[PDB]
Amino acid sequence: SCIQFTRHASDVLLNLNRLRSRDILTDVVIVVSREQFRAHKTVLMACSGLFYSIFTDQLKCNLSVINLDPEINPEGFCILLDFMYTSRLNLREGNIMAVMATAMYLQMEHVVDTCRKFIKASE
Amino acid sequence: SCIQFTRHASDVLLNLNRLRSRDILTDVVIVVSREQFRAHKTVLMACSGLFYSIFTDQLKCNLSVINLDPEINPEGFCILLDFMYTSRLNLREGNIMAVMATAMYLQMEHVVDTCRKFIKASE
Amino acid sequence: WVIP
Amino acid sequence: WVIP
Numbered sequence: 001s002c003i004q005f006t007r008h009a010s011d012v013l014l015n016l017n018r019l020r021s022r023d024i025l026t027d028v029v030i031v032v033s034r035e036q037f038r039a040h041k042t043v044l045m046a047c048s049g050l051f052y053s054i055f056t057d058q059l060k061c062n063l064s065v066i067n068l069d070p071e072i073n074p075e076g077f078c079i080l081l082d083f084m085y086t087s088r089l090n091l092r093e094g095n096i097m098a099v100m101a102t103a104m105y106l107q108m109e110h111v112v113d114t115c116r117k118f119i120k121a122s123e
Numbered sequence: 124s125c126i127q128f129t130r131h132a133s134d135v136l137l138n139l140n141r142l143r144s145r146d147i148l149t150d151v152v153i154v155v156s157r158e159q160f161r162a163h164k165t166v167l168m169a170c171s172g173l174f175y176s177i178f179t180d181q182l183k184c185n186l187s188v189i190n191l192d193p194e195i196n197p198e199g200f201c202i203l204l205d206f207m208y209t210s211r212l213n214l215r216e217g218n219i220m221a222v223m224a225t226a227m228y229l230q231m232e233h234v235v236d237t238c239r240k241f242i243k244a245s246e
Numbered sequence: 247w248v249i250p
Numbered sequence: 251w252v253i254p
């Protein structure tokens with residue numbers, strides 16, 4: 001018999017992104033080659049099969065620094081991290097291959113799906 | 124020029140609620156009289172003007188336990204905490220006064236609004 | 247607010 | 251996916 005507030009989930013996500021911008025309560029640094037990205041472990045797990053696996057691990061859950069595979073592109077990670085916190089994906093011709101490869105690695109199936117459909121339309 | 128995934132914010136919130144149920148990465152206990160509620164500080168701040176004020180405070184941000192005013196009803200808090208993590212509000216005749224008073228204290232303006240409209244319709 |  |  002509950003009532004539901006339609007915009008609630010979007011409002012929560014907007015405030016989680018505000019916390020990320022102000023660096024409030026961030027508990028991990030993701031290292032992608034020469035670049036560093038601060039984030040909230042809970043948001044990373046909620047969006048990515050890879051981070052969900054990492055942060056449920058009894059040893060890795062306590063790490064303050066996570067280093068990604070050297071093949072991962074920092075811009076691709078940046079675009080996906082922005083997507084995690086906003087639902088918006090900055091998908092462009094010049095970055096689509098890097099975004100799709102990063103999404104496959106991060107296990108972000110909905111992003112992988114769309115990257116596939118956008119590449120298929122161009123061939 | 125971004126594309127947007129409509130269900131992303133709802134999917135994030137559903138996984139944050141799954142983390143709460145499994146007690147993963149919860150970093151605070153909210154004490155309401157004889158009852159205890161584990162939660163994520165980031166979600167509490169994102170939903171409540173009161174917790175936003177508390178956890179941006181340079182001293183209170185590091186507390187593992189927060190005690191609420193003894194006038195706060197545990198059931199009212201429980202209903203609001205469930206709302207924070209799901210967008211669903213279990214608003215009933217028997218709990219509406221407690222829910223509205225707790226929402227005013229927590230500074231959850233959209234919940235206060237609706238409680239007011241539901242009470243006005245019954246008078 | 248809606249009936250879900 | 252949509253055009254926001």
Ligand SMILES: N#Cc1cnn2c(Nc3ccc4c(c3)CC(=O)N4)cc(Cl)nc12
Nearest residue numbers: 045046047048049052108109138141142
């Ligand atoms: N507790 C918990 C919890 C926190 N996060 N999380 C999940 N995170 C996830 C796992 C796999 C994938 C994605 C997100 C996006 C995607 O494409 N795959 C799943 C579950 Cl079943 N549970 C949880």
Ligand SMILES: N#Cc1cnn2c(Nc3ccc4c(c3)CC(=O)N4)cc(Cl)nc12
Nearest residue numbers: 015018019168169170171172175231232
């Ligand atoms: N950074 C940050 C950040 C984290 N959370 N948060 C806000 N949380 C909030 C503040 C007031 C109210 C509500 C939520 C619901 C309501 O009725 N009032 C606001 C801002 Cl402006 N910023 C942030």
Ligand SMILES: [Cl-]
Nearest residue numbers: 108109110111
């Ligand atoms: Cl995804």
Ligand SMILES: [Cl-]
Nearest residue numbers: 231232233234
């Ligand atoms: Cl609210």
